[PDB]
Amino acid sequence: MKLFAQGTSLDLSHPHVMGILNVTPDSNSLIDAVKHANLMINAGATIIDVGGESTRPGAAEVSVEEELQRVIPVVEAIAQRFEVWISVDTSKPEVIRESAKVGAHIINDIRSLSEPGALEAAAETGLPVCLMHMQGNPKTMQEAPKYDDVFAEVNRYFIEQIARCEQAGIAKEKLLLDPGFGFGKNLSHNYSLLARLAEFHHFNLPLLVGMSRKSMIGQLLNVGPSERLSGSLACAVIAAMQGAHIIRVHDVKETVEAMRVVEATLSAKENKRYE
Amino acid sequence: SMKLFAQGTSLDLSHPHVMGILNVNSLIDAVKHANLMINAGATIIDVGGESTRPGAAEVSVEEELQRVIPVVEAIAQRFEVWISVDTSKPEVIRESAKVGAHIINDIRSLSEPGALEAAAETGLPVCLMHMQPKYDDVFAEVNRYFIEQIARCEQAGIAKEKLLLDPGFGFGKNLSHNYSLLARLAEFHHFNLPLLVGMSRKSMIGQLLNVGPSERLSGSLACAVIAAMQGAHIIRVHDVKETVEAMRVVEATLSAKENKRYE
Numbered sequence: 001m002k003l004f005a006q007g008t009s010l011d012l013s014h015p016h017v018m019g020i021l022n023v024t025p026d027s028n029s030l031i032d033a034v035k036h037a038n039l040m041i042n043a044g045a046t047i048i049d050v051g052g053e054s055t056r057p058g059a060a061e062v063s064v065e066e067e068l069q070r071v072i073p074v075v076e077a078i079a080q081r082f083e084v085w086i087s088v089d090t091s092k093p094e095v096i097r098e099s100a101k102v103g104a105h106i107i108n109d110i111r112s113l114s115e116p117g118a119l120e121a122a123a124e125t126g127l128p129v130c131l132m133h134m135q136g137n138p139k140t141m142q143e144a145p146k147y148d149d150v151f152a153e154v155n156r157y158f159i160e161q162i163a164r165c166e167q168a169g170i171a172k173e174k175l176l177l178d179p180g181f182g183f184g185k186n187l188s189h190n191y192s193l194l195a196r197l198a199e200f201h202h203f204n205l206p207l208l209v210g211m212s213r214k215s216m217i218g219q220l221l222n223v224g225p226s227e228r229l230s231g232s233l234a235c236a237v238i239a240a241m242q243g244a245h246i247i248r249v250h251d252v253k254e255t256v257e258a259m260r261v262v263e264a265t266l267s268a269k270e271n272k273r274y275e
Numbered sequence: 276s277m278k279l280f281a282q283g284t285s286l287d288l289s290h291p292h293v294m295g296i297l298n299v300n301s302l303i304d305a306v307k308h309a310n311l312m313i314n315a316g317a318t319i320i321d322v323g324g325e326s327t328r329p330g331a332a333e334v335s336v337e338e339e340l341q342r343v344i345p346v347v348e349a350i351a352q353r354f355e356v357w358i359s360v361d362t363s364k365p366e367v368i369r370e371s372a373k374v375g376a377h378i379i380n381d382i383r384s385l386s387e388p389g390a391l392e393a394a395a396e397t398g399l400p401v402c403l404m405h406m407q408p409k410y411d412d413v414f415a416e417v418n419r420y421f422i423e424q425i426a427r428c429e430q431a432g433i434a435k436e437k438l439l440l441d442p443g444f445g446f447g448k449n450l451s452h453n454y455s456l457l458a459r460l461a462e463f464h465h466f467n468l469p470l471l472v473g474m475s476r477k478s479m480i481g482q483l484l485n486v487g488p489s490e491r492l493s494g495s496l497a498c499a500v501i502a503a504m505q506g507a508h509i510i511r512v513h514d515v516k517e518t519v520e521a522m523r524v525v526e527a528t529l530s531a532k533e534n535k536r537y538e
């Protein structure tokens with residue numbers, strides 16, 4: 001299993017660590033962003049995820065001009081200084097288009113190209129696209145998350161969105177699937193998805209997961225956001241043992257170390273996965 | 276449903292337990308360190324008065340009794356926690372039981388003259404560990420070893436319901452042997468006995484990551500999660516708090532799974 005973008009490839013026979021580079025200001029961003037990316041690359045991240053719109057519960061929307069200002073210079077600088085792959089965490093067709101031009105490898109849209117023109121703009125780049133499940137939108141998703149059967153519903157959603165991208169001329173082989181931990185889900189919904197994650201392999205597509213420092217850990221352990229490293233590594237290991245291909249994290253070094261132990265364990269397994 | 280009974284209490288192995296490592300005014304400090312590990316969430320404390328590392332210094336009976344017995348006794352009196360004792364000597368097994376120890380954790384699987392009978396006398400749970408690097412099929416050797424020791428114990432009057440099995444990570448085993456047993460750990464459930472593992476800070480992590488003994492936390496956690504996801508019942512560690520947290524995540528995952536195990 002491999003992805004192709006920007007005249008290079010990514011080999012997904014072993015788990016990759018995707019380092020989070022949030023570039024939403026809180027009350028020199030370009031230089032600090034590149035310093036941060038550098039540490040993460042040295043720590044072993046093989047993909048950096050650049051995000052200019054907070055997608056957290058309750059988050060406010062960001063204008064296209066502001067998102068571009070935050071994201072595009074950062075993507076460019078990384079693409080010319082380093083060789084690491086670059087995912088852009090955006091829903092906006094103009095950010096998708098512009099990101100690609102300055103060297104982005106993966107469109108990582110939490111809205112799965114649901115915005116006007118997103119689907120065509122992503123098709124136009126030819127880049128790999130990650131489709132994520134979210135119930136509702138970031139402003140209201142955590143109000144009252146509800147499923148009769150969360151796995152079945154997320155699974156159906158992936159069927160529908162794969163089709164949607166196929167119809168738009170994006171081939172199955174470009175797609176990644178992310179069950180969207182924390183995006184319109186309570187505690188038990190998240191753990192049901194984590195527990196049954198290997199069953200999403202039936203699509204024969206790369207799985208991407210992001211649980212780092214999330215409330216599914218915070219609420220379970222009753223610890224604050226800075227106190228979640230051990231819990232984050234447990235979630236990472238659990239996902240990667242079930243054949244998850246990309247692990248989106250804040251703490252790169254520690255995750256990279258944990259993924260080696262997982263790689264050593266899987267290569268000594270006969271069938272290369274846990275279920 | 277699994278359960279162990281000792282010293283009038285019981286250990287419920289429906290979820291994974293963290294066993295904290297305690298190496299033996301040193302009595303006051305041992306009790307301080309027991310206290311911190313309990314606070315961190317260890318439900319078993321493993322006490323050793325002969326360091327069971329390969330090549331460590333052998334001690335006499337008198338010396339081991341003098342080190343271990345006071346500490347076991349102190350912990351038994353002050354705390355509710357279970358107490359594992361790392362010993363191979365019948366006298367230490369015998370005296371440890373008298374002062375409240377719950378588990379005889381013998382890395383030599385009761386091979387020393389008299390250890391088997393002393394263990395049987397106590398009525399206590401016994402952990403059988405594999406030890407000896409060269410094997411055709413490391414899993415099958417360890418598995419064959421367990422069938423043999425289970426029989427040897429049963430023969431001496433120790434019921435199956437008392438036994439725990441430990442494949443002995445890092446004991447006469449190179450990197451690839453260790454990862455083979457870890458990868459196949461779930462297969463040891465055919466015995467229907469508790470599984471205890473101890474990989475914390477070992478060279479199977481140090482060599483893989485190329486870091487020193489104080490920098491192996493993440494890999495140690497990775498090993499614990501890997502074992503616990505396979506239904507391992509007791510995890511032996513240095514870093515109690517971090518392992519307990521990781522086990523909580525594993526427990527939430529296993530609870531949402533129809534199978535209660537990964538294979």
Ligand SMILES: Nc1nc(O)c2nc(CNc3ccc(C(=O)O)cc3)cnc2n1
Pocket residue numbers: 051055056057089108109110130132178180181182183208209210211213214215216248
């Ligand atoms: N592909 C992808 N996959 C994710 O999982 C993700 N998460 C965020 C961050 N958003 C969240 C959501 C929930 C939580 C919480 O529950 O705590 C925290 C942060 C941003 N981009 C993402 N992209």
Ligand SMILES: Nc1nc(O)c2nc(CNc3ccc(C(=O)O)cc3)cnc2n1
Pocket residue numbers: 327328329361380381382402404441443444445446471472473474476477478479511
């Ligand atoms: N039941 C049980 N199970 C163990 O795994 C264990 N380990 C030790 C500690 N011994 C070792 C062995 C090897 C290594 C290394 O390779 O580095 C480190 C420590 C002591 N008692 C133990 N008891």
